[PDB]
Design a protein around this ligand. Structure first.
Ligand SMILES: C[N+](C)(C)CCOP(=O)(O)O
Ligand SMILES: C[N+](C)(C)CCOP(=O)(O)O
Ligand SMILES: C[N+](C)(C)CCOP(=O)(O)O
Ligand SMILES: [Ca+2]
Ligand SMILES: [Ca+2]
Ligand SMILES: [Ca+2]
Ligand code: NA
Ligand code: NA
Ligand code: NA
Lengths: 142, 142, 142
């Protein structure tokens, strides 16, 4: 059993290593980030991530944020994050409903005045509140 | 132990998620379909799949069939399936020897009269009996 | 439990199968080889492999050697191996410090006279001792 678990864990690290080495994904803690390289709107990204068994990416730590930023930088495009504006303007929540804890707004943001209910990440990693209909890099977390 | 199994299962879903998101494979039930994008003959596909630890794909449900059809459609090529004609013309078997259950013949097929011992899938998902020497998209199941 | 371990092992083989079929890696025994396709110096390859959770590749059997050779052949470039010269010229060690067992030197090699502390693999699989600053295919083992 112990010999079987080792082998299983070894093989997992091998496949994760291969995917990591080839830039197919980024591992941060227990979270894995990945993109299909496509630029689509918020609703479309949501579907793509869930179809793959994951969710539209959302950073909850500075290290997770930088990981997504590096992907945004790599593809030279902004990234829609897994959060939307509440009823009260300026207040945002994760898709499960919980209010956002970690934030990294670009100075002055959010200021869409309730008209920009989605959140995009600039290539430097800072956030901007934005309409949900733009074409943005699809980044998922697993 | 339970904490170790969760982590293992979590990491598996992560790697499967990454491969899924990037179109490297399709998951249907307990079956995974994948292609190397190459177009070769029946014998060559057989070898490639087994070298990868899998088998030349064969659909046994409508959902498995549509999955392979989507790959055929994606690469704009027909797909050799994991089945060949018996001694009696019009009767086909899986490679283990068992007679074919689920079928999706294009109307009028099979009618190769025993001269077309292999089976190819059109891009709409329907089947045609065919000679085994054509260049076809290599699709494997794992 | 036994049903859970089977499923886990099945899914592992599926992901390994997909990666194998698509040429993303080579499996030899319990060792997996992979490349990101990049050509950089020894120190850079070392870092890339360890960042992915692996190590710069080193063959310890003829089958492992041929596996790496095939990758070298595929990318038409030589490969830096995971070994460097001791203080005594002509003597080489693995990166953990242990002296090299299996070798496959091209005839006459090594003869860098202590000036060529790294080891490169030619596309035919044979070894040459070389300076560590050249651009070589980055191949990792996991
Ligand atoms: C996509 N882009 C961020 C590089 C520029 C275009 O952005 P946008 O027109 O959707 O606001
Ligand atoms: C490959 N193709 C199906 C698109 C057309 C050619 O098919 P075939 O000549 O092998 O019968
Ligand atoms: C890279 N190469 C092996 C194909 C030729 C150049 O090699 P080198 O100039 O680094 O010695
Ligand atoms: Ca804004
Ligand atoms: Ca026919
Ligand atoms: Ca030399
Ligand atoms: Na707003
Ligand atoms: Na026939
Ligand atoms: Na030397």
């Amino acid at each position: 059993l112990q010999t079987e678990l080792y082998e299983i864990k070894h093989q997992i690290l091998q496949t994760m290593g291969v995917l990591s080495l080839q830039g197919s994904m980024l591992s941060v803690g227990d979270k894995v980030f990945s993109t299909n390289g496509q630029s689509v709107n918020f609703d479309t990204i949501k579907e793509m991530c869930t179809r793959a068994g994951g969710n539209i990416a959302v950073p909850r730590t500075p290290e997770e944020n930088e990981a997504i930023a590096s992907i945004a930088k790599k593809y030279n495009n902004y990234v829609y994050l897994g959060m939307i504006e509440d009823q009260t303007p300026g207040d945002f929540h994760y898709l499960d409903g919980a209010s956002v804890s970690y934030t990294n707004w670009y100075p002055g943001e959010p200021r869409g005045q309730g008209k920009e209910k989605c959140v995009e990440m600039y290539t430097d990693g800072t956030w901007n509140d934005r309409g949900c209909l733009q074409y943005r890099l699809a980044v998922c977390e697993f």
